[PDB]
Ligand binder design. Structure first.
Ligand SMILES: [Mg+2]
Ligand SMILES: [Mg+2]
Lengths: 48, 149, 48, 150, 48, 149
């Protein structure tokens, strides 16, 4: 049972690391969306 | 931890398709007969122990599974070229592809975790540094991610 | 022209007898050439 | 201490986030910028109460740890309240020459640079969103109503 | 060791649930950024 | 079996895709049994000529690399389509892609070369031929290089 719980906890740690990596990636992609939004907004304002 | 579980279907398919071209005897392993002959057919035939010293990266034998985990652990931390270009564009607000070496240095040598002077020099002696000390990160991300390359 | 016609005639004679005879039987299944033809047609019309 | 545990934690996070030169201790001048980033509006005289380096302090030798930072944040927070938008726009109603509830951009941007503490055109221009286009007479309501969100 | 592993696995489960909640929130916020981008783009075009 | 650098990416892809259809058991070789199955899928019982024409060249089973060099040596003698079109354009009286067949025939029999009238006629039976005899070399280069348009 100790061995089983060790395997399960290591799997959950791996999944947690994957989830944190995904969170960081989603954050940086949201910053990309924000950057594009600002750039396009400024382009439309300058064209106007 | 088990790194293999991290990767995209497209990346796994790319590795599988590549491996299928190398696994010429179809035993599922990396072997002396196949990749050396393949590389000799594709280029200058470096069939010397330089290739054995590369095959010896795996613990003893080198199965497709071991190849996958090796390349997996090597790809751990890497991100899309567009996402990295976005991250650079946070400083290059005009999106010029022309960030200065002084700016790049300031962003790396003290701010956050410190890049060494050796790593900074590497970014000039391999990576696309240009006239007046402008740096073309749009080319950098292409060679870093091996996308469209 | 002498070198070009020598080369083209030499190849033309051989591709009418060699493994091209097998290849040509498989060729119409190679969808890549059809998509390439479509792409080329679109590019040609775009250019026009 | 009047601050909550959550506020103290947030201040400690901010303290180590707005870094670094190299050391983990904040610079004497930069501390004021941290307090201002935390939305406070004290005068530089509040720092002059501590009076680290009586001379010009490019060196910033009077660096702060969190235990030295937090009391300054507290004395700032307990310094004074701030008035409503009417107290602001009364100033504009005095500066104005039209008597219409707006003000000339070129004049007001200059006045806000010359009077009191000094600011750059780079600083001031970023405060306005109703920019001086075909119309010279900017409605100062937009300026105050925007910045007071901070 | 069983008690320790139980505590650790419960903590990792809590962290994983938090990470998944955060992932969902970041996704929905990215969709919000996209929606605002489209709306503001259309507004700038119509104002121009 | 040095080949990968010698031919165009499109040609190599075409050969690879073709080979994939013939390698029915999917292992990177092609055997007598694979050719037999292929010929059975294409038509009647084997005429042997096609299969013997591979087995006489090969030491036994044929590797994809060996297949590539075989087709490579078979394609050796071809040149770039634009370069050939340029060479023909030096002599095209219409200056448009349509050199006259009598002119082309004369050029094959006077300028050092002495190509036989039967072989010249074969180039109008199987390679292109057009109205008034204005041979379409623009189509000829396309089928010579296998660069479709
Ligand atoms: Mg093998
Ligand atoms: Mg096979």
């Amino acid at each position: 049972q100790v061995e089983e719980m060790k395997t399960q906890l290591e799997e959950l740690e791996d999944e947690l690391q994957a989830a944190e990596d995904a969170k960081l990636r989603l954050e940086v992609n949201m910053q990309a969306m924000k950057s594009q939004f600002e750039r396009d907004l400024q382009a439309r304002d300058e064209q106007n | 931890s088990n790194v293999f579980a991290m990767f995209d279907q497209s990346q796994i398919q790319e590795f599988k398709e590549a491996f299928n071209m190398i696994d010429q005897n179809r035993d599922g392993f990396i072997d002396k007969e196949d990749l050396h002959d393949m590389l000799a057919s594709m280029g200058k035939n470096p069939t010397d122990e330089y290739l054995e010293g590369m095959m010896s990266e795996a613990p003893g034998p080198i199965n497709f599974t071991m190849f996958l985990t090796m390349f997996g652990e090597k790809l751990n931390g890497t991100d899309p070229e567009d996402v990295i270009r976005n991250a650079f564009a946070c400083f290059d607000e005009e999106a010029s592809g022309f960030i200065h070496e002084d700016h790049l240095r300031e962003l790396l040598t003290t701010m956050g975790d410190r890049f060494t002077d050796e790593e900074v020099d590497e970014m000039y002696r391999e990576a696309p540094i240009d006239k007046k000390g402008n740096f073309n990160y749009v080319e950098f991300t292409r060679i870093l991610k091996h996308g469209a390359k | 022209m002498k070198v070009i016609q020598r080369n083209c005639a030499a190849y033309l004679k051989l591709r009418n007898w060699q493994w091209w005879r097998l290849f040509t039987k498989v060729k119409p299944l190679l969808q890549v050439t059809r998509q390439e033809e479509e792409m080329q047609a679109k590019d040609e019309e775009l250019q026009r | 201490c009047d601050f909550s545990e959550e506020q103290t934690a947030e201040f400690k996070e901010a303290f180590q986030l707005f870094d670094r030169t190299g050391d983990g201790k904040i610079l004497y001048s930069q501390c004021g910028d941290v307090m201002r980033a935390l939305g406070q509006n004290p005068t530089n005289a509040e720092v002059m109460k501590v009076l680290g380096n009586p001379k010009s302090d490019e060196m910033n030798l009077k660096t702060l740890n969190f235990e030295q930072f937090l009391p300054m944040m507290q004395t700032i927070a307990k310094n004074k309240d701030q008035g409503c938008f009417e107290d602001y726009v009364e100033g504009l109603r005095v500066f104005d020459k039209e008597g219409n509830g707006t003000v000339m951009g070129a004049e007001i941007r200059h006045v806000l640079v010359t009077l009191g503490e000094k600011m750059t055109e780079e600083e001031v221009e970023q405060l306005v969103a109703g920019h001086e286009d075909s119309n010279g007479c900017i409605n100062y309501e937009e300026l105050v109503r925007m910045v007071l969100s901070g």
